[PDB]
RNA sequence: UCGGCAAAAUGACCCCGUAACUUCGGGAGAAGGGGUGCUCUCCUAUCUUUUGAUUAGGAAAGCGGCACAUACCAGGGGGUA
RNA sequence: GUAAGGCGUGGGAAUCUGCCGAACAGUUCGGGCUAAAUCCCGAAGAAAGCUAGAAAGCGCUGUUUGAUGAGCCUGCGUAGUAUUAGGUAGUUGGUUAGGUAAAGGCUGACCAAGCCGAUGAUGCUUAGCUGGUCUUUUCGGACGAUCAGCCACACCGGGACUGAGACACGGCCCGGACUCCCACGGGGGGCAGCAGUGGGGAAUCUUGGACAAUGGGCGCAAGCCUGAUCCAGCAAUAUUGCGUGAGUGAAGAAGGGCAAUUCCGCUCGUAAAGCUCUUUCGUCGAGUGCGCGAUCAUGACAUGACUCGAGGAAGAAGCCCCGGCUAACUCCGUGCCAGCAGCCGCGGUAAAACGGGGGGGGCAAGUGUUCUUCGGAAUGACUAGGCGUAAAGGGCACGUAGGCGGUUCAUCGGGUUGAAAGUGAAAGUCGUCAAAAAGUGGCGGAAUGCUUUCGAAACCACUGAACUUGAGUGAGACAGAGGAGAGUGGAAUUUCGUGUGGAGGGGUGAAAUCUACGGAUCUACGAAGGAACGCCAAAAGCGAAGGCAGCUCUCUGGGUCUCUACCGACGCUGGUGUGCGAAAGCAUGGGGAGCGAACGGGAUUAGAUACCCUGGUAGUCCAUGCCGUAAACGAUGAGUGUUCGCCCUUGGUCUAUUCUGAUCUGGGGCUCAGCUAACGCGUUAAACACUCCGCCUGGGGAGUACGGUCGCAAGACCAAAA
RNA sequence: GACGCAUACCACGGUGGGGUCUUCGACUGGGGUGAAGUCGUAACAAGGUAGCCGUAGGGGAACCUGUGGCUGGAUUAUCC
């Protein structure tokens, strides 16, 4: 535009939608599991991904992924929820944090194990 | 008179890139001839003649093949004498060669002379 | 009670305020509110045929009562098929 | 809470100001509170006395002042939203009274109808503002938490009193909600002070010590207060800090991993252990303390620090990663499962990508993950981008505001510019030194600004006199499907009539419906009617665009050329607005040949709501209104200046030297350059520059939803989000 | 100084409209995505009837048809 046009009507910003609107600009949110289930991935991937329907403390209903192999979650279990989507599964935009609240860590995990709540094995 | 000054400087640039020997400028002004005197002093043009400056003025310019670009500002730009050097740093594309022409209360001067005389004013334009 | 049938209520003038919708005419007195008697004193006018005091309207200060359209007369209103 | 009664910055006049500094004058007499007074009242002139314990020392009062604060006003600067266009009625102004310390519609009365608003009032939403913090080659963006300056508030609303100062966080009165006692009549309370507790939350600390220092209140002091502060406690929350050793060491030990099972087979690995040295940090034991913070004196910190001694490598290394982006590879297990994933992608029997072993890489008392900000992102482009074919030129104009726009001479001093003065708080950023060893300070610079004074006079603005090159007129020549009105012409189609004539015509890929012996098609002449105007004729012409075609006449808009004519910058663009605007469609009345949505029939086909055939309504035409949209396209906004040529052509003029040149004017083809992602554009640019407007910011959702305006409707315009 | 249950102003409270938002709602739409189902074959080649724009009508459904416009279609040694 001309300089006079920019004086009259400036420049707006780019419009981009929020990724995790339900976290409400918090790093984590506590929740309680409503339904623990599995979901199949979008093609070309094929598995049975363990997810959980979680109602958050601000009364938002989200789908969160349960990472790792095996979990102890049931209905009405407390889970701490962090951001981060799962690319196989549309509509799943969050993760459950292992080793906090009801979701236990994974013993026997040895590598990358602070992302799975696993302690350091004591040397004997 | 900013529009006719830019018209004349662009006419000079365009016939310069055609490899011509001379141009005719019309309409002219005293600001235009002072800009051309500064250009002649720095060697960018060879010579210029003013014809009938008080009735219907036209200017003949002699060309040498030495100027890349002459521009007149089309907007008001104030500069202080302590501000001239950083403006010239930001305005010349090479930041080394070329001159900024300023209208001062001491007259129309190039930027180095205006720094030396410690006088500010309005930027007319530049050439390099 | 078949059903507010009948009754009760509203009701006048002046001022404020008036919605949905509309064929832009309406709806509309929508709805909802306030004042109203008398005495004195000013102001205005009554196009005063007894013009230096009489009527109408308005301000302002008072007076009495439960009550000032005191009797008589005199719309109930709104929403929706 | 507050979007301007606030804040930042600079000013002003119509005010007050306890304590503090400095002058001058006074400090007299009665009464009242059970008793008195520096308490209250009265008289003069305003007051108030205490102390010979504080006797010329305090205190008070009045008048002049300095200083410091406070109140009031004001210029400039300081959000989003028009899918919010009108708002105001003490409102805007005047007069006169009142009120205030003080100007003032601050408000009573009277008078006028003003005031604010497209340069965005009012409505709605959000928000304390600043110094500054983080990021960033300058600009910007986000933030306004700590700390300091200003403002606002103190459970929620409303008030005033006292006072120099408050409409007062830990004061008073009233109303409200909540709450604690109550002997039941009634009372009491307000942590958004410091600690602390419930609650909410992913998440944020001790119910600590001392007034030693600094600051503050009271007191003549001595002192007394001070959860201001100072200092300890908790928390890897942050910080370019320090440490976890320094050497040596081959039985290359054991053990682990890999291996034609290569060179001690390769590697963990000189790694460990062992041996020698040093003990920072932390640990333990002592000793001086006018070491130091503090001095006349006073030390919470301080169970510290400092100094000395004991001791023994002793007490101190993880986290992420190793397919590519990206530094770092092998074995086993699994077998599109389990799982991984920032992106691209991995896993379906030899997976460097999943999980474990072994090895390795990066950082390191941290390191990853999530959230949030800036950068990379020139990905909202001022710096520094675009719109022919990728997102994006408004269908086209006219014009309001606004923006932008020729020459000379003279004047002036508002902008501009030079210097001086004032201001720009401190802290922070930058420079430098010293200090310190994860810590501090001084002096500068910067603070790009505003006010005042005095210079300058080129530019912008303003004033005056002039100029003619841009715009506009006139005179004289022209061209034109420019527009509107009124007349008129012929060909052809259809229908009808009359002669002659007799068998089909029409139509298809092939057929059939249809039409024809009531005589068609065909042939001659005639009649009626509507619509469109062949040839000319087209890369021609005209119009702003949409558009405009037979001919005549009337009325009329614009354009071109020439001039030793006038006039004198009157110009360009154009938000909001206004107008014009194919076709289809709508309303009323006409008209209706041909064509033809819908529809009927005949066919094709698996079906055929089509394509083909045959009938054919609205419509297509006229008059008057509405609508306001098109691939309304050159998919190219309007304008101005400049840039090598060649070939044509429209309409003029001049020169001609018998056939052409020159110069304007539009319209085309080609091209040197230059430009372009490429195709291509190229004096009618998409070239070299500029002015002004419109528009774009990944795809889909979507030109959809909602709302407003407009329309008789059909719909149109502005136009999202999940 | 009272003081008057004297006027004014005024909070709370009552009441009627506006402006601007918001909870819930029988039912009825739209959009996005998907393995594979049903019906057809609309577009891309002249895509089998060139395609597309505005507008109008018609149809299970893509779509078809008129009308004006566009080329962002292919094919095809100008002739008084
Ligand atoms: K995972
Ligand atoms: K301040
Ligand atoms: K309050
Ligand atoms: K103290
Ligand atoms: K951490
Ligand atoms: K050690
Ligand atoms: K114009
Ligand atoms: K033309
Ligand atoms: K014209
Ligand atoms: K012509
Ligand atoms: K070409
Ligand atoms: K041009
Ligand atoms: K169509
Ligand atoms: Mg009943
Ligand atoms: Mg009745
Ligand atoms: Mg009755
Ligand atoms: Mg009367
Ligand atoms: Mg606004
Ligand atoms: Mg707030
Ligand atoms: Mg701010
Ligand atoms: Mg509270
Ligand atoms: Mg006091
Ligand atoms: Mg007082
Ligand atoms: Mg308190
Ligand atoms: Mg507290
Ligand atoms: Mg909690
Ligand atoms: Mg002190
Ligand atoms: Mg003292
Ligand atoms: Mg304390
Ligand atoms: Mg460190
Ligand atoms: Mg030590
Ligand atoms: Mg010790
Ligand atoms: Mg000491
Ligand atoms: Mg300590
Ligand atoms: Mg690599
Ligand atoms: Mg394998
Ligand atoms: Mg990897
Ligand atoms: Mg792995
Ligand atoms: Mg940027
Ligand atoms: Mg950058
Ligand atoms: Mg730019
Ligand atoms: Mg771009
Ligand atoms: Mg452009
Ligand atoms: Mg256009
Ligand atoms: Mg367009
Ligand atoms: Mg001059
Ligand atoms: Mg000046
Ligand atoms: Mg400073
Ligand atoms: Mg410092
Ligand atoms: Mg320093
Ligand atoms: Mg039409
Ligand atoms: Mg008709
Ligand atoms: Mg049929
Ligand atoms: Mg047909
Ligand atoms: Mg027909
Ligand atoms: Mg359009
Ligand atoms: Mg067209
Ligand atoms: Mg000619
Ligand atoms: Mg030409
Ligand atoms: Mg381009
Ligand atoms: Mg335009
Ligand atoms: Mg539309
Ligand atoms: Mg609508
Ligand atoms: Mg088709
Ligand atoms: Mg097809
Ligand atoms: Mg096609």
Which of helix, strand or coil describes residue A70? coil
Question: From the CA of B113, how many Å to the C1' of D70?
Answer: 55
**Resolution given for this structure, in angstroms:** 2.1
CB atoms inside a 10 Å sphere around CB B47: 12
CB atoms inside a 10 Å sphere around CB B98: 21
CA distance A74 to A104: 12
Nucleotide nearest to A42 (CA to C1'): E34
Residue pair A52/A82 in contact (Cβ under 8 Å)? The answer is no
Sign of CA dihedral B112, B113, B118, B120: negative
Question: From the CA of A4, how many Å to the C1' of D718?
Answer: 23
Reference B11, options B70, B73, B97, B58; nearest CA is B70
Q: How was this structure determined?
A: cryo-EM
User: Which DSSP letter does residue A23 get?
Assistant: G
What residue has token string 């009735």? B55
What residue has token string 């500064």? B38
Strand pairing partners for A39?
A: A49
Long-range contact list for A14-18, CB < 8 A, 24+ apart?
Answer: none
Tell me the CA–centroid distance for residue A12 and ligand 53, in Å.
59
Q: Could you give the C-alpha distances from B87 to B1, B82, B127, in angstroms and in order?
A: 22, 10, 14
Tell me the CA–centroid distance for residue A68 and ligand 36, in Å.
21
CA distance A80 to B122: 65
Strand pairing partners for A64?
A: A52, A94
Tell me the CA–centroid distance for residue B23 and ligand 58, in Å.
30
CB atoms inside a 10 Å sphere around CB A51: 21
What residue has token string 């599991």? A33
């Amino acid at each position: 535009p001309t300089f006079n046009q920019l004086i009259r009507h400036g420049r707006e910003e780019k419009r981009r939608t929020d990724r995790t609107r339900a976290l409400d600009k918090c790093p984590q949110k506590l929740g309680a599991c409503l339904r623990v289930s599995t979901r199949t991935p979008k093609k070309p991937n094929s598995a049975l991904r363990k997810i959980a329907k979680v109602r958050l403390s601000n009364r938002h209903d989200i789908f969160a992924y349960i990472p790792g192999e095996g979990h102890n979650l049931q209905e009405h279990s407390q889970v701490l929820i962090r951001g981060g989507r799962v690319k196989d599964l549309p509509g799943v935009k969050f993760h459950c944090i292992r080793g906090v609240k009801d979701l236990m860590g994974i013993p026997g995990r040895r590598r990358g194990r602070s992302k799975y709540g696993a302690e350091k094995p004591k040397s004997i | 008179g900013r529009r006719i000054l830019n018209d004349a400087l662009r006419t000079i640039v365009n016939a310069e890139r055609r490899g011509k020997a001379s141009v005719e400028l019309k309409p002219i002004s005293t600001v235009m001839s002072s800009f051309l005197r500064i250009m002649k002093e720095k060697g960018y043009i060879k010579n210029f003649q003013v014809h009938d400056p008080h009735r219907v003025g036209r200017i003949t310019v002699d060309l040498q093949g030495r100027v890349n670009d002459c521009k007149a500002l089309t907007y008001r730009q104030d500069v202080k004498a302590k501000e001239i050097e950083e403006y010239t740093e930001r305005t010349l594309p090479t930041r080394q060669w070329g001159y900024v022409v300023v209208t001062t209360p001491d007259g129309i001067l190039d930027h180095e002379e205006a720094i030396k005389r410690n006088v500010g004013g309005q930027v007319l334009g530049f050439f390099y």
